[PDB]
Amino acid sequence: NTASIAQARKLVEQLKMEANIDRIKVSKAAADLMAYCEAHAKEDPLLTPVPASENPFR
Template sequence: MDVSSSLQQQRIIVEQLRREAAVDRQTVSESCAAMIRYITQHEQEDYLLTGFTSQKVNPFREKSSCTWHRIA
């Protein structure tokens, strides 16, 4: 590896580190509070909590019964 490519690689790393250092950070407690707030606000839309109004709107229902045919 020559010096110019090594220098270019180091510049790329420094730029990446500068971008990472500029990222806005939140404390864990702030992030948890925001997640709890979001979950609480959207729990009525969560089918895992409320279930489906009918099986017709359930995308996970079995489409058809499983059948097998005996080949003679």
């Protein structure tokens, strides 16, 4: 059935595009993820609670 064929054709084209991706190593991406967290850690009020005078919800 042409309709099933067209759907299969679209599947093949989408997979071809997804096959051609510049994937990087997991170690490198995990390291980058940590770097973000560490650098912005001191800016984060939930991770690092602040004095009551700085808290709008005190």
